[PDB]
Each structure stands twice: as structure tokens, then as C-alpha cells.
Design an enzyme around this catalytic site. Structure first.
Site, mmCIF file in Angstrom:
data_model
loop_
_atom_site.group_PDB
_atom_site.id
_atom_site.type_symbol
_atom_site.label_atom_id
_atom_site.label_comp_id
_atom_site.label_asym_id
_atom_site.label_seq_id
_atom_site.Cartn_x
_atom_site.Cartn_y
_atom_site.Cartn_z
ATOM 1 N N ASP A 493 0.811 -1.223 0.000
ATOM 2 C CA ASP A 493 0.000 0.000 0.000
ATOM 3 C C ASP A 493 0.842 1.269 0.000
ATOM 4 O OD1 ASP A 493 -1.557 -2.213 0.702
ATOM 5 O OD2 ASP A 493 -2.067 -1.437 2.686
ATOM 6 N N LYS A 581 -5.488 11.682 11.085
ATOM 7 C CA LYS A 581 -5.366 10.709 9.994
ATOM 8 C C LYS A 581 -6.205 11.052 8.758
ATOM 9 C CE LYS A 581 -5.365 6.763 7.533
ATOM 10 N NZ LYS A 581 -5.276 5.429 8.200
ATOM 11 N N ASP A 762 -4.815 1.484 -4.521
ATOM 12 C CA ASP A 762 -3.422 1.873 -4.269
ATOM 13 C C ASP A 762 -2.638 0.743 -3.599
ATOM 14 O OD1 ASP A 762 -4.789 2.103 -1.829
ATOM 15 O OD2 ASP A 762 -3.508 3.746 -1.138
#
Length: 833
Positions: A493, A581, A762
DNA sequence: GCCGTTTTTACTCCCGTGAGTCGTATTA
DNA sequence: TAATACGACTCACAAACGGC
RNA sequence: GGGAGUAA
């Protein structure tokens, strides 16, 4: 006999599937697909005065045609569209659809039922009439197969498309309304009842099922399932993926209208088609060992998995026999009971999801190799068509594994342990330490593979089922050796897909650096770097800040906490990387300060109060606003170069979507424009937007009144200049990002011998033996695009040019390149993607 | 110039009305 | 033309950006 | 229109 195209399109898929794999699974494959549907019909006859309704309906339809043909002038709009099918089937659909809309839904508005009938009575054409003929195949009695069919050898009765509801949204309603009109004669089975007559935002016309039928009564959702055979290669805009011609074909690009899809018919984008087809051809299989655990643990009343909610419904407490009178009786417990309803719902919604994920995993469990057809949104991003996906959550991903494995050890065994660490809460630390973490817990592992039901240590990990999938696989190596063939997908990732790309297209550094683009011994945690700056400002307000105020807005008066108050509340909670985050990510998608308030409140504040650990936040929303202000300031000095890049994109799309103006003259020098750019691998992406308009139909319903439903017009209008400006910036990064992932696959494959892929936008996963090459392929392909097409420079060339004049003075232009060596990524250990 | 509304895309899953009037495209 | 359906138009039950 | 889940 019969006649008309359709005989061949229903036979070709079966025949080709029965030649390579035999009539065995060729029978099962069609039954599994057509099982949309096939169960939907089975759900209808269930359910299934009727032996009196159908003959009464058919008789009316025929009488209605005679009445219309006898009269002069313009015939009802629905008339000619209803003469496409045999009157017997026209009645059949009307009964089916009306029942389907009323049984599984508690309303139901007329313009929704009429739309559903019109769409069903269209294919029809179409796709329905074929269903009956195609259904015959799987209801009769009663290797090398994992090979993709040659695209050139495919019959033309499989290439065709039409994935959009033909006709004019209006024409589809006409058909439905007239069918309901003929359904209420005769019998009527349903009643037309007026609701909230008078209220502007509540007045509606809803279909009510007759009380007689409601007392005489008797998804999810087999429309899109995995493939048992390699999916049909995407040759054109429609027809790829699935094989059956009895169903409506898939669209390569999921658009809002037919016209938007038709813009792709003659484009020529070989790199786009190639990428989708390689990702689509990825052979998957169900992870038996993980499935055996998932079937047992989810059944438990108290599962070890945290996210695993009740179960335990938890009742409403309690009504202390006080009625009563007065501010004691209803406040309290009204507020206390309101807190329970939301507690159970946030449990209910999470449980309902859990139930569906397991039901889907159970359906597609057994079976040698299984496949998943692939689509793309209106941008580059690749999606798995079926519900059960390798792109799902922890459990769903854990239940799946690759079919064909490559042996295997030494090189693969290294990254196998890296993947094991990643599944656990260990993914922001150097690789040698990740290996150390696995080698330390050699007793904790092996034992979890020995008896997973007895040993629940893996359940405590960050990714429970995915770590369990590693545990069974890690034990397999220890018993068989480095020759033990493995096929577990090892995910890679990108640290922060978005800021990584913005840093690559504008040669950041700084930024990323921060997003692990450069080779470093330590893992660059961008979410932790921002939180460090947040805590720095948080401490400053703790001793020197604002005091509490009383805004008194009208009792009614409330206390507005000063910066000192909120600073203390956050320090008594601990602002870590998880608080910022989502906030750091969303900004890289064109977010604002007010938007962050909603995020922190949903992700941090509310769950803390719900967990009984948020007693600090006396004023939750004011506390969310304060933190949103701290992030906005701290993150700005983190993605600087990034900000300007976005502001350059925002200004570009703003002026493209803007409508021209002149000195008192209404001169249309330039209309509103859709933002367009081409991503590196050749995928084109348009970001347009037409002004949403509403039209009304004039229907003489049952000769009593004029049914006039306001409907959303599918007919195109004027270009929405506001959305053209606000959408130009995002769409850009969107497309680019989409192609990126696509490019990765193609490259990697074509180059190395990598056949299987696990893609989550991704994330990049493959077998351990090919993991080393993929870990290298993801780097090479990104270093190949930039430079090689200067995303920003390439994007600039698209609208060079499209800018008017006296507009380029407001369009800067241009983020300067830093001093990052792109080759350093190859040496960077902690930039998994 | 003033007032009102809104603040990454998309996809998947779960739980505005008829009447009055008029023009017009259509067909025995 | 003569008749038929219906669409098209109107009327009444904290800060920033865009529209009226 | 709202809620939930996943991806960027």
C-alpha cells in the site's frame, strides 16, 4: 418457429464454454449468473389469486389498443412502446414489477413504480424476451478451462452493448403509468392514494396495495456474482466481463447518462483497455482455512473481534415510573433513551453489514478457481463487479486467496513475514524489525494455526482474518520447507495515495519524504508529523489562551469555551496520529476547515462519548471546531507545495466552468466547459456537469384527473458553469490516479512473469515468489510516468489553450520541482507502494 | 448590491400536485 | 379537416460563492 | 433527501 436475433447470442456463450470446460460447468456458470433474477422470479412466484388477475389484465390491454386505434389525432405516448411486446407478456411484467415494488418497500411513490415497469417493459426489446429463451438452457437437465477466450474469436452477438435505460425517462414513465392505469380497471389490484395534499415538500402520489391482497400475501442479490471462467475481454465500450446475452451488458465506464458513455465509442485508448483486461484476468480462489474459521467465530455470542458488535440488542432503560411531571420526567429520560437508539443503530448498521459479508462469502465458498469481472468508474479507478470482492474488508479479503502459486521460498518467505507484520499493528517500522516481530512470536504463531478456535491471539491483531490467513501459511512453510508452494497475496500500500502523487507531479520533497517516497531507514509517518505540530500549538494554548465566554443567544444562554478550555480537554485525551489521519488525507482532495470539524466529530469525538471515554468534551461541536482549526494551520505548512498545486487546479476548473459576461450585452462569447485531461497510460477523463432540470408530464389518469409527476429530466440542457469550476480540480487528480494503478499492472505483468494480481486502488498484491518483482514494478512505473509525461505539465497542455484571456493573469503557475531523487524509492524499504 | 445556500466522487447497502387553457403533432 | 393525446406554461393548495 | 459500509 421463433426468429429474430437472440438465438445465436444465447447459444454462443454456452457452446464456447462447453467446448473448453465441458457442458458441466458451462451449465452451472450461466445458472449462477442468470441467478439474478432466476431467484428473483422464484421470489416472485412465492409471493404468487393471480390466476384471475392475468387474464383480466390481458383482456384490458387488447381492448385499450382497439379504443386508441379507433380514435383520431395523437396516440398516447405509451401506446407505441407497449406494442413492442406481446400483450400477454405486457400484463405479466405489470403484475411482477408492481408486486416487487410494494412487497420489499413500504411506500411507494407512483413515479418510482411507473419507472420500474417502464424499464422492465423495455427489455423487452431487448433483454427480457431473451431471458425466457436463455433460461431454457440451465433448466434442461436439470481443464484447460481457466483460459481466457480469444477476443477475435468472440461472436458479434456478444460485442454489443446498451447499458443505459433507453427511451426518454419521460417515455419510460408513460409506459408505467398507463400500465398501472390499466392495472386499476381491471382489477384494480392496487389503489392510487393522495398523500399530504397541500405541503410543498411532502405532497406525493403513492401506490397502495389493496387490503385484500395484503392479507393474502405469501436483497441480496444475485445479479452480479464472481465468474467461474475468465471474463470476456473488453473490446469496446460495452459487452465485456460477463458472458450471458440474456442480461443487460456492462458498461466500461459507469456514467450518469447514455450520452456520457457514448463519448467513448470511438476514442481509441489501448493502454486503458489492456490494463482493465489484465486485472480482470486475475485468477482468484477462496481461502479454505480462513473460511473454516470465519464460519465458526462469527456465530459466537461474544466474538473476539472488536469491530464485532452484538448480538446483545441492549434494551431501552428504563422509565422510573415517573409520569409526572415535569422537567424531571421528560428530559431525561428522553435524552438518555435517544442515546440508546443511536447506540443500537451504529451497532445495527455494522451488524447488518457483517451479516451480508458472511452470506456472500458462504455463497462463493467452495469451487476450484473463481474469477471476478472488472469495471472502472468515470475516472481511472478499477472496481470488481461482484458483491463478494478481494477489495472488501478484513474478513472478505481473508476468505480469499490466489489459485495458481509459484514456488516460492527464500525470496518469497522474506516478504511473507513482512505481510504478516503488516496485518498486525506493525507497519510503520523498518523491515528488519518487522522480521524480528514475526521471529519473536514464533510461539504465538504456529499455535494459532494449530487451533485457531482455541487460540485467539490473531483476533487481537489489526487485521484479524488476514493475519490468520498468514498464520496457516506461515505454518505450512515450517513443516514442508522452502519448497512449500504458496499463493497468498502480499499487499503493498502507498503511504498516502494523493500526497504521494501531488509530490510526484510537482516534484515535492517535502512533500514525501513525509509520504515515504524517498528511501529512509525510518518510516515517515505524515499523520504523526502533523499531530506533533498540533500538540505543539495545543500546549501553547494550555497556559496562554482564551477564557470561557457566554454568547447568550435567544435562557436561552450557553457557554462558549475559550482556547484554554479546549486545549485541556484534548491533552486529557491524547491527540495522536489517528485524530489527524483522515484530516490530512481529505485536504489532499480539496477540503476546507468546516469540513474537518465534521470529520473529527465523527471519527474522534462521538465514538469517545459512546465508549464512555469522551467525558472531557463538554461542548463536543465547539471542541471539534477547535481541533479543525489546529489541523488547518499545522497541515498547511506540511503540504505547502501541494496547496499551490491544488489552488492552480481549482482556479483552472473555476474559470472553465464559468459563463462569460459582457458590457450590458448578453453576448455568449464562451459557454461553460467540462474539465478534461489524459492520464499517462492513455485513459481520458472528463469532468463535466449539465444543469439538472425538472419536467412534468400531463397524464389523464383513469379519465378522472390529470396525474402530473415532476420528474428528473434525462434530456440534456445548459452546461452547469458552477460544477464545471468546482469539479475541474478533483476530476484531474482522479483520472491521473486511476490510470496510475492501471499502468502499474500492465507494466509489471508484461515485464516480469506476474500473472495474478490483488488490486485495491493503491494496494498491490501478488504471490510471495512474485512479490519481489511487484515491490520493484510499482516503483519503476511511477518513476516512468514522472518524468515521462509531467502530469502537471501534461495536464497544463490539455487546457493550455482552453483559457480565454484576462484569465491567465489569475492562473499561477507553476509549482517548482524540488531535489528528490526518484531512484531512491527503489531503495526505500518502508514505502510499500 | 443584497440575500440565501453550501462545504473532495462514486458506488453499494439499507430503509411536488391536478386543473384550466392552448397549441400541436398525429391519424381515421 | 375532425378528432385524439399530450407537452408546455400558469396558477393555487463563520466564511465564501452563487443567484436573484 | 437521510443513514451505514468499502476505495481514492
Amino acid at each position: 418457429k421463433n426468429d429474430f436475433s437472440d438465438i445465436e447470442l444465447a447459444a454462443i456463450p454456452f457452446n464456447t464454454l462447453a467446448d473448453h470446460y465441458g457442458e458441466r460447468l458451462a451449465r452451472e456458470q450461466l445458472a449462477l449468473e442468470h441467478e439474478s433474477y432466476e431467484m428473483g422470479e422464484a421470489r416472485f412466484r412465492k409471493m404468487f389469486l393471480i390466476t384471475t388477475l392475468l387474464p383480466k389484465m390481458i383482456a384490458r390491454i387488447n381492448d385499450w389498443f382497439e379504443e386508441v386505434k379507433a380514435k383520431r389525432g395523437k396516440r398516447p405516448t405509451a401506446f407505441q412502446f407497449l406494442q413492442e411486446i406481446k400483450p400477454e407478456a405486457v400484463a405479466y411484467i405489470t403484475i411482477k414489477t408492481t408486486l416487487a415494488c410494494l412487497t420489499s418497500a413500504d411506500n411507494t411513490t407512483v413515479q418510482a413504480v411507473a419507472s420500474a415497469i417502464g424499464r422492465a417493459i423495455e427489455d423487452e426489446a431487448r433483454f427480457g424476451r431473451i431471458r425466457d429463451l436463455e433460461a431454457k438452457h440451465f433448466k434442461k437437465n436439470v481443464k484447460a478451462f481457466m483460459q481466457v477466450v480469444e477476443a477475435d474469436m468472440l461472436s458479434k452477438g456478444l460485442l454489443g452493448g446498451e447499458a443505459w435505460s433507453s427511451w426518454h425517462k419521460e417515455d419510460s414513465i408513460h409506459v408505467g403509468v398507463r400500465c398501472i392505469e390499466m392495472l386499476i380497471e381491471s382489477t384494480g389490484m392496487v389503489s392510487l392514494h393522495r398523500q399530504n395534499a397541500g405541503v410543498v415538500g411532502q405532497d406525493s402520489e403513492t401506490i397502495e396495495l389493496a387490503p385484500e391482497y395484503a392479507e393474502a400475501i405469501a436483497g441480496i442479490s444475485l445479479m452480479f456474482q464472481p465468474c467461474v471462467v475468465p471474463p470476456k475481454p473488453w473490446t469496446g465500450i460495452t459487452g465485456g466481463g460477463y458472458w450471458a446475452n440474456g442480461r443487460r451488458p456492462l458498461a466500461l465506464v459507469r456514467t450518469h447518462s447514455k450520452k456520457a458513455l457514448m463519448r467513448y465509442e470511438d476514442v481509441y485508448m489501448p493502454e486503458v483497455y489492456k490494463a482493465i483486461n489484465i486485472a480482470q484476468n486475475t485468477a482468484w480462489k477462496i481461502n479454505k482455512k480462513v473460511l473454516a474459521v470465519a464460519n465458526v467465530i462469527t456465530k459466537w455470542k461474544h466474538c473476539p473481534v472488536e469491530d464485532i458488535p452484538a448480538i446483545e440488542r441492549e434494551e431501552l432503560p428504563m422509565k422510573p415510573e415517573d409520569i409526572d411531571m415535569n422537567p424531571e420526567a421528560l428530559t431525561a429520560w428522553k435524552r438518555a433513551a435517544a442515546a440508546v437508539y443511536r447506540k443500537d443503530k451504529a451497532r445495527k448498521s455494522r451488524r447488518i453489514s457483517l451479516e451480508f459479508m458472511l452470506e456472500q462469502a458462504n455463497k462463493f465458498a467452495n469451487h476450484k478457481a473463481i474469477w471476478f469481472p472488472y469495471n472502472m468508474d468515470w475516472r481511472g479507478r478499477v472496481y470488481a463487479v461482484s458483491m463478494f470482492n478481494p477489495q472488501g474488508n478484513d474478513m472478505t479479503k481473508g476468505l480469499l486467496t490466489l489459485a495458481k502459486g509459484k514456488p516460492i521460498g527464500k525470496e518469497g518467505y522474506y516478504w511473507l513475514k513482512i505481510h504478516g507484520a503488516n496485518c498486525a499493528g506493525v507497519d510503520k517500522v523498518p523491515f528488519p524489525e518487522r522480521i524480528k516481530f514475526i521471529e519473536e512470536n514464533h510461539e504465538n504463531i504456529m499455535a494459532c494455526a494449530k487451533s485457531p478456535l482455541e487460540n485467539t491471539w490473531w483476533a487481537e491483531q489489526d487485521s484479524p482474518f488476514c493475519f490468520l490467513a498468514f498464520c496457516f501459511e506461515y505454518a505450512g512453510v515450517q513443516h514442508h520447507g522452502l519448497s512449500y508452494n504458496c499463493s497468498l497475496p502480499l499487499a503493498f500500500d502507498g503511504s498516502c495515495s494523493g500526497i504521494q502523487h501531488f509530490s510526484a507531479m510537482l516534484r515535492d520533497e517535502v512533500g514525501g519524504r513525509a509520504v515515504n517516497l524517498l528511501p529512509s531507514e525510518t518510516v515517515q509517518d505524515i499523520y504523526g508529523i502533523v499531530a506533533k505540530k498540533v500538540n505543539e500549538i495545543l500546549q501553547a494554548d494550555a497556559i496562554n489562551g482564551t477564557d470561557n465566554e457566554v454568547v447568550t443567544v435567544t435562557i436561552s444562554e450557553k457557554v462558549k469555551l475559550g482556547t484554554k478550555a479546549l486545549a485541556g480537554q484534548w491533552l486529557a485525551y491524547g491527540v495522536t496520529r489517528s485524530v489527524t489521519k483522515r484530516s490530512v488525507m481529505t485536504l489532499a482532495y480539496g477540503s476546507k476547515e468546516f469540513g474537518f470539524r465534521q470529520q473529527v466529530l465523527e471519527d474522534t469525538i462521538q465514538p469517545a462519548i459512546d465508549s464512555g471515554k469522551g467525558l472531557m468534551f463538554t461542548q463536543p461541536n465547539q471542541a471539534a471546531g477547535y481541533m479543525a482549526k489546529l489541523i488547518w494551520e499545522s497541515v498547511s505548512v506540511t503540504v505547502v507545495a501541494a496547496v499551490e498545486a491544488m489552488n492552480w487546479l481549482k482556479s483552472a476548473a473555476k474559470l472553465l466552468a464559468a459563463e462569460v459576461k459582457d458590457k450590458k450585452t448578453g453576448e455568449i462569447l464562451r459557454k461553460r466547459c467540462a474539465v478534461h485531461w489524459v492520464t499517462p497510460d492513455g485513459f481520458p477523463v472528463w469532468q463535466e456537469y449539465k444543469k439538472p432540470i425538472q419536467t412534468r408530464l400531463n397524464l389523464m389518469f383513469l379519465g378522472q384527473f390529470r396525474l402530473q409527476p415532476t420528474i428528473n429530466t434525462n434530456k440534456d440542457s445548459e452546461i452547469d458553469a458552477h460544477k464545471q469550476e468546482s469539479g475541474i480540480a478533483p476530476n484531474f487528480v482522479h483520472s491521473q490516479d486511476g490510470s496510475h494503478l492501471r499502468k502499474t499492472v500492465v507494466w509489471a505483468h508484461e515485464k516480469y512473469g506476474i500473472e495474478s494480481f490483488a488490486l485495491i486502488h493503491d494496494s498491490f498484491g501478488t504471490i510471495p515468489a512474485d512479490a519481489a518483482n511487484l515491490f520493484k514494478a510499482v516503483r519503476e512505473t511511477m518513476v516512468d510516468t514522472y518524468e515521462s509525461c509531467d502530469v502537471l505539465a501534461d495536464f497544463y497542455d490539455q487546457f493550455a489553450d482552453q483559457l480565454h484571456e484576462s484569465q491567465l493573469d489569475k492562473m499561477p503557475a507553476l509549482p517548482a520541482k524540488g531535489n528528490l531523487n526518484l531512484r531512491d524509492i527503489l531503495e526505500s524499504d518502508f514505502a510499500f507502494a
